[PDB]
């Protein structure tokens, strides 16, 4: 499936000026648009070549939507202080993430519309797009207000309406990069440790999309508890990389094989030292 998501952050700067407000847009893991309140001339911007072809009206309206959102966030930052009985001298953060995950037939798989205050969950729209989950007492106030104003109905219209429709358009205009598939180039390194064993690390490089399975196997079995990994890491060029390692006994390396699966790999690779 694919996804269209918007990540928003507003950081209050008491003692400096207005809250730093920001919006970032992604279709899967590629950022394609951005809005920064601090920029000299705050207006939505392209972060991927394939969105640049959108007309000035697309850009003007998105810039207008982002500013309305900035105001809303400035206001909520003040309300919070009140809800949590906090001082107006400290800096606080308010995050918002909204988006939709959709299958090939364009059917909404999962919708999101959630907030966090100072890094902790505040309130989130439930999977049913009908009810809200409030993390605490302050959030209840908000939940009851939104329950009364029928907020979930309007927000659901976006996730099921515009989110989905614009997602297919983007995937289309940007298929060349967004739907591309780069196989992973792999290899394994060797390191004799001081505990008198060896660490074997399997690298998978320059692949895309992100999804990948890097695994170590011994006697055709997955060493699920012995592996040390690192979450898939990004690169400026849009590709990803990763490694999985395991510690093995001296002179027994040839018993271990690295197994890597990927969209760009007709069949799983199997490497050795």
């Amino acid at each position: 499936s694919h996804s269209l998501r918007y990540f928003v952050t507003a950081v209050s700067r008491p003692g400096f000026g207005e809250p730093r407000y920001m919006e970032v847009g992604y279709v899967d893991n590629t950022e394609f648009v951005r809005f920064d309140s601090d920029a000299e001339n705050p207006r939505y911007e392209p972060r991927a070549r394939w969105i640049e072809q959108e007309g000035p009206e697309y850009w003007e309206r998105e810039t207008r939507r982002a500013k309305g959102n900035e105001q809303s966030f400035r206001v909520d930052l003040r309300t919070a202080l009140r809800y949590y009985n906090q001082s107006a001298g400290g800096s606080h953060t308010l995050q918002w993430m909204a988006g939709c995950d959709v299958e090939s037939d364009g059917r909404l798989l999962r919708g999101y519309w959630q907030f966090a205050y100072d890094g902790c969950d505040y309130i989130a729209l439930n999977e049913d797009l009908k009810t809200w989950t409030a993390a605490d007492m302050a959030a209840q106030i908000t939940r009851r207000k939104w329950e009364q104003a029928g907020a979930a109905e309007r927000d659901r219209a976006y996730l099921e309406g515009e989110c989905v429709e614009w997602l297919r358009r983007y995937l289309k205009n940007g298929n060349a990069t967004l739907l591309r598939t780069d196989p992973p180039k792999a290899h394994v390194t060797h390191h004799r440790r001081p505990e008198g064993d060896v660490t074997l690390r399997c690298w998978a490089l320059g692949f895309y999309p992100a999804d990948i399975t890097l695994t170590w196997q011994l006697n055709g079995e997955e060493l699920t508890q012995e592996m040390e990994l690192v979450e898939t890491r990004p690169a400026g060029d849009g590709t990803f990389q990763k490694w999985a390692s395991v510690v093995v006994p001296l002179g027994k390396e040839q018993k271990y094989t690295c197994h890597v699966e990927h969209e760009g790999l007709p069949e799983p690779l199997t490497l050795r030292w």
């Binding site: 206001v75 519309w113 908000t142 927000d155 976006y158």
Partner: peptide, 9 residues
């Protein structure tokens, strides 16, 4: 396009 805030906290 992105989401719009239509309700205050």
């Amino acid at each position: 396009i992105g989401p719009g805030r239509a309700f205050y906290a």
